Design a protein around this ligand. Structure first.
Ligand SMILES: Nc1ncnc2c1ncn2[C@@H]1O[C@H](COP(=O)(O)OP(=O)(O)O)[C@@H](O)[C@H]1O
Ligand SMILES: Nc1ncnc2c1ncn2[C@@H]1O[C@H](COP(=O)(O)OP(=O)(O)O)[C@@H](O)[C@H]1O
Ligand SMILES: [Mg+2]
Ligand SMILES: [Mg+2]
Lengths: 119, 535, 526
């Protein structure tokens, strides 16, 4: 019903900065909240941060103050600019979208973007 | 433009084509359409003031002078003595909405009248009435799918009845029984929940007995998880209360047997006479002894009985009811868990029903008694006993509770719920406008007209609530567009908020979809009529 | 546009559709007409009406009863029909308040007309009226007093309530007399609410003070021919048997023989069956036998030969009342006499009342049934006395059920209006105005009570309003001298049930009448 695309990747430790986007399409009439999640191998998915329609953003505890999550309502998309990258920030980044009154059967997840690494 | 054909001949000879052509009338073409539209507009403008919580009632007087005060569009248009065939179509439309749904009977008429009123402007500009009907069909499909889109879902379980009580209260907001608003809503919910195959199956209303008795207060209206009967115990010295009652339900009159075939028992001697005499005595005694031996503490017959049987019941401590009707016998059986027995010989302790209380109830200075059967274990039947100060509010309460029960039924059939207060209509109008911005120019006037007609329900609600229609509707439309929120509508009760999702104003998705579909289909059949040949 | 004033009329010949203002106009004028009709019968100094029906019989009634007045009038206004049904329902629920509810509804609708003229929506008015009804209910309930525990104080409340109910009626001439009757008549029921047990016999002639409450029971039936006429220490069998050519319920049964001799034998067998029935009866050891059904010549002869007084053709009501007053069991089978309870009374004689003979049962056992003999100069006087007694008895039964009382004489209405006023002055908006109108109607009830006597209604209602604002919650009208007094001391008390029902039914009917904005009449059948 809700088709979700994510554009990300490109880990860098030289200073550390990345930006990952998430765009939604399909059948709905409102995206109440958009959230970024992290899932590592052998870890439990957590919430990086999340933004509401009114722009109100709530950050997480292990990482905060370096967040540039911004929501374009004109196209119902979101962009996370995260800096100070580190090895434990290397995981799969999932997008979350609550729609149409925000019920428990309204959360729509993305396929997740794993952040590559060189060798 | 009338009087059928009139030429009589270009040769002077009589021209008779149709029987009573001189007494008959006919309207052809656009004037027929305009007559139809005026008739429909009159009916719809009559009904629109009975719409919403602040909607007012109508007092219908029948042929024999009985008065009916009501807000129900189906009851109004049924009691309304119309002679215009297009008004009859609107009566049928409201009746159809009531049959299928049980609510919306006034929304359908107002909306259809609005659609025809807008088609009136479209015909003036020269569009074919069929093209208007097709644009209306297109826009109606759009609005129906958009309702499916903005719809919400509610839990129809018996453990969280708050969404259902909110829906029933929304249904009863516009009725005179909102003085006991929640008290009424609760029982409607419980009623439908008691009597229902809840596997998204049907709800049989024959299992809900809606009885009214003048007297008392509306606050006395209650739900009896069992049955009420308009009868009393057969003997005046029987007890008026029976606790832990073992009930024998019988369709055999407590009288000596009688074959259905033409029979003649011939007495030819004094010995035959004495044998007949003792046969009668022993039949009465044997009936009462069989009723006692089954273990029953109460008897309920359908066909009345005689002096010997009545006194034997009294003597044997067997309170009994007689002349109970077939439907009431069935309901008593279903509620008490008992089986209906056709003869005493077939009566056993397993065929008995059980009711934890059987009582005879009085109503003040009346001489009228009623029988309550309740405290059953798992009664699959139920009764709503309505009290009040006059037969008008009692009958209005009956129909209002029917509307509430029908709404809960529609929830059991489909749990999906759209939000009311005109919010759904505004959102559908916005969706139709959006799709009209995309269609080719010519079916765009008809889609814009459909939108302008859908917007009449919020206007009617605001107008009935004293607000300014255009201001309020434009403000809430702008808010709906800006902050995506199809729950924004008319604050008929002036709670401050325009958000109906917060005010717990709730409609059924099937209700709105049926309104739209029925209004559109009947408007289509009316625009398709262009000739009338009335006598 | 409009339904009627449209280019095309959409209706059958003879129907019609009164719109907003015309509908409220007809509704208000009809309701206010009904109310102004039924008032002037209100209060101790209320006057009677004549119900000169135009039927083929031209029945004549003289009533102060609002329910009867409204039932017995040909009404054509639908709102008036609503008020009529409301008064009927009041008469059904309780036995008093049929004129007070009607006047109250009419006054509420008058005030609602005034408010609608003020450009107020008939929704805001009903909202304020609901709030005012709530406030009034609480004030009434809080002022109510209960004395059913103390037996003597309860007797005082019963006497006072009967007096207040009869004050307005033709029996106020001999109020104390009938008060005693009514009280005794309900106390003989011993808690039961069966008003069918209280039989009222209307015997033309004599003064209204010659009326009395029989210590025993009276029956307007006949004794058999060769049967006794006086019985001491009477044991009574009350029955519902046939005793009238009693046929075996087999209906296909037919006597089919080849000799008149056998027909005669079967006739003799029928008679022997009836004789054995009579003997089973006599095996109960009785001196009086009362049958709901007839008693034919042969069982009459048998009972006469046995020395038993056999009263026949009593009705369902007669046998029920006899069972209640004597203690017997209504029986239809006599094969187990040990199970049939008999009735007992010290004496059964025949008495004269007017020009008619009646069976008098004295020294009865239970007494939970009564007979009131009403004497009067005219059948209209007798009918009005029966109606007034029915009012008083119904109210006393309702009080025995619920001993809650509330003081009358306009004290209750003024108190409720005081509560509504307190609520109103703290409320913002036009709902305060509708609350004030509710209060005005409540005040207009004692105003009318005072008007009907001829006093300065304005002055007295002002005094009462000031008293109830000060906190003297028991101030009411003293209608002997025409002043204000203490209803608790003067003994002017009403049944809380009755006053609450008055308030609620009046407000509810006014609410339903006010919700109307269209009256669509259909072509009359006539
Ligand atoms: N409390 C309320 N607030 C706002 N709108 C309401 C409220 N109650 C009902 N309505 C609206 O009034 C309209 C008419 O409802 P009602 O008159 O009760 O039954 P019907 O739909 O049969 O006319 C509905 O479409 C609903 O949206
Ligand atoms: N002695 C009295 N002083 C003051 N008021 C009285 C007195 N006796 C009766 N009343 C009042 O007279 C009224 C009689 O009303 P009634 O005609 O019975 O009304 P309804 O027919 O509606 O019952 C009662 O409401 C009571 O308040
Ligand atoms: Mg409705
Ligand atoms: Mg009275």
């Amino acid at each position: 019903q809700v088709q979700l695309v994510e554009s990300g990747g490109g880990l860098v430790q030289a200073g550390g900065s990345l930006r990952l986007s998430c765009g939604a399409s399909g059948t709905f009439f409102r995206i109440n909240d958009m959230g970024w999640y992290r899932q590592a191998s052998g870890k439990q998915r957590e919430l990086v941060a999340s933004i509401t329609r009114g722009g109100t953003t709530d950050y997480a505890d292990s990482v905060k103050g370096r967040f540039t999550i911004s929501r374009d309502n004109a196209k119902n998309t979101v962009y996370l600019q995260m800096n100070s990258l580190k090895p434990e920030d290397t995981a799969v980044y999932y997008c979350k979208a609550n729609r149409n009154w925000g019920r428990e059967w309204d959360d729509y997840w993305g396929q997740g973007t794993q952040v590559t690494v060189s060798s | 433009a009338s009087m059928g054909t009139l030429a009589f001949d270009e040769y002077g000879r009589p021209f008779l084509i149709i029987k009573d052509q001189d007494r008959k009338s006919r309207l052809m073409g656009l004037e027929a359409l305009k007559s139809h539209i005026m008739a429909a507009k009159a009916v719809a403008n009559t009904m629109r003031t009975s719409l919403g919580p602040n909607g007012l009632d109508k007092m219908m007087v029948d042929k024999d002078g009985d008065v009916t005060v009501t807000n129900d569009g189906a009851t109004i248009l049924s009691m309304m003595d119309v002679d215009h065939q297009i008004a009859k179509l609107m009566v049928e439309l409201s009746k159809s909405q009531d049959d299928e749904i049980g609510d919306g009977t006034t929304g359908v008429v107002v909306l259809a009248g609005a659609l025809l009123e807008e088609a009136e402007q479209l015909l003036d500009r020269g569009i074919h009435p069929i093209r208007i009907a097709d644009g209306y069909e297109q826009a109606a499909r759009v609005a129906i799918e958009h309702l499916d889109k903005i719809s919400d879902s509610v839990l129809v379980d018996i453990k969280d009845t708050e969404p259902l009580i909110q829906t029933a209260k929304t249904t009863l907001g516009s009725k005179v029984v909102n003085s006991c608003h929640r008290q009424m809503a609760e029982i409607a919910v419980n009623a439908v929940l008691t009597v229902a195959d809840m596997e998204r199956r049907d709800v049989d209303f024959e299992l809900i007995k809606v009885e009214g008795k003048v007297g008392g207060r509306l606050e006395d209206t209650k739900l009896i998880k069992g049955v009420i009967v308009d009868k009393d115990f057969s003997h005046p010295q029987m007890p008026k209360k029976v606790e832990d009652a073992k009930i024998a339900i019988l369709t055999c009159p407590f009288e000596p047997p009688k074959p259905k075939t033409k029979h003649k028992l011939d007495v030819t001697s004094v010995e035959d006479y004495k044998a007949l005499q003792k046969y009668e005595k022993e039949k009465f005694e044997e009936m009462i002894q069989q009723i006692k031996e089954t273990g029953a503490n109460l008897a309920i017959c359908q066909w009345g009985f005689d002096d010997e049987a009545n006194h034997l019941l009294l003597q044997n401590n067997l309170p009994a009811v007689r002349w109970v009707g077939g439907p009431e016998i069935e309901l008593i059986a279903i509620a008490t868990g008992g089986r209906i027995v056709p003869r005493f010989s077939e009566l056993t302790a397993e065929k008995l029903g059980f009711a934890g209380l059987v009582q005879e109830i009085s109503f003040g200075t009346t001489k009228d008694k009623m029988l309550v059967i309740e405290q059953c274990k798992n009664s699959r039947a139920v009764t709503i006993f309505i009290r009040g100060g006059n037969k008008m509010i009692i009958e209005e309460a009956k129909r209002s509770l029917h509307d509430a029960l029908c709404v809960i039924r529609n929830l059991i059939r489909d749990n999906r719920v759209v939000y009311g207060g005109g919010a759904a209509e505004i959102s559908c109008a916005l969706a139709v406008s959006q799709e009209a911005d995309k269609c080719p120019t010519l079916e765009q006037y008809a889609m814009r007209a459909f939108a302008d007609a859908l917007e009449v329900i919020p206007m009617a609600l605001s107008e009935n609530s004293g607000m300014n229609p255009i201001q309020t509707m434009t403000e809430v439309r702008a808010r709906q567009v800006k902050e995506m929120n199809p729950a924004l509508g008319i604050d008929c009760l002036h709670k401050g908020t325009n958000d109906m999702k917060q005010q717990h104003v709730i409609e059924t998705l099937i209700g709105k979809k049926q309104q739209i579909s029925l209004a559109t289909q009947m408007v289509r059949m009316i625009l398709k009529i262009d000739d009338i040949r009335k006598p | 546009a409009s339904l009627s004033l449209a280019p095309v009329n959409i209706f059958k010949a003879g129907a019609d559709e009164e719109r907003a203002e015309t509908a409220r106009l007809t509704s208000f004028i009809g309701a206010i007409a009904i109310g102004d009709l039924v008032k002037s019968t209100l209060g101790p100094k209320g006057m009677d009406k004549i119900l000169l029906s135009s039927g083929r019989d031209a029945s004549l009634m003289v009533t102060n009863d609002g329910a009867t007045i409204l039932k017995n009038i040909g009404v054509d206004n639908p709102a008036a029909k609503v008020l009529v049904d409301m008064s009927r329902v009041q008469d059904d629920e309780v036995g008093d308040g049929t004129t007070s509810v009607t006047v109250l509804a009419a006054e509420l609708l008058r005030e609602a007309e005034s408010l609608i003229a003020k450009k107020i929506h008939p929704q805001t008015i009903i909202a304020g009226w609901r709030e005012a009804t709530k406030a009034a209910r609480e004030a009434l309930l809080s002022s109510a007093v209960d004395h059913g525990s103390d037996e003597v104080k309860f007797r005082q409340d019963l006497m006072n309530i009967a007096g207040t109910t009869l004050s307005s009626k033709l029996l106020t001439h001999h109020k104390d007399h009938f008060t005693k009757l009514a009280v005794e008549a309900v106390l003989r029921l011993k808690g039961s609410g069966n008003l069918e047990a209280i039989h009222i016999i209307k015997k033309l002639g004599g003064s209204l003070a010659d009326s009395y409450l029989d210590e025993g029971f009276l029956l307007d039936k006949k004794i058999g021919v060769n049967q006794p006429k006086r019985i001491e220490n009477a044991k009574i069998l009350i029955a519902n048997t046939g005793m009238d050519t009693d046929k075996i319920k087999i209906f296909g049964s037919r006597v089919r023989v080849d000799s008149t001799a056998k027909v005669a034998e079967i006739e003799h067998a029928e008679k022997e069956k009836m004789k054995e029935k009579v003997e089973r009866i006599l095996k109960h050891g009785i001196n009086c036998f009362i049958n709901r059904q007839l008693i034919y010549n042969y069982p009459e002869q048998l009972f006469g030969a046995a020395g038993v007084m056999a009263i026949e053709h009593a009705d369902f009501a007669g046998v029920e009342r006899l069972a209640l007053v004597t203690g017997g069991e209504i029986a239809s089978t006599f094969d187990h006499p040990e199970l049939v309870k008999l009735g007992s009374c010290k004496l059964i004689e025949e008495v004269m009342i007017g020009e008619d003979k009646l069976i008098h049962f004295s020294g009865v056992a239970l007494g939970e049934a009564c007979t009131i003999v009403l004497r009067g100069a005219t059948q209209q006087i007798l009918d009005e006395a029966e109606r007034s007694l029915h009012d008083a008895l119904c109210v006393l039964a309702q009080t025995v059920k619920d001993s809650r009382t509330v003081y009358g004489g306009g004290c209750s209405e003024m108190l409720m209006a005081h509560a509504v006023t307190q609520l109103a002055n703290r409320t913002p908006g036009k709902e305060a105005v509708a609350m004030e109108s509710y209060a005005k109607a409540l005040r207009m009830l004692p105003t009318i009570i005072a008007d009907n006597a001829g006093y300065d209604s304005a002055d007295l209602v002002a005094q009462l309003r000031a008293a109830h604002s000060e906190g003297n919650t028991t101030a009411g009208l003293d209608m002997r001298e025409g002043t204000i007094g203490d209803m608790a001391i003067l003994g002017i008390t009403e049944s809380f049930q009755v006053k609450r029902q008055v308030l609620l039914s009046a407000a509810e009917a006014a609410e339903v009448i006010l919700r109307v904005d269209n009256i669509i009449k259909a072509a009359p059948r006539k």
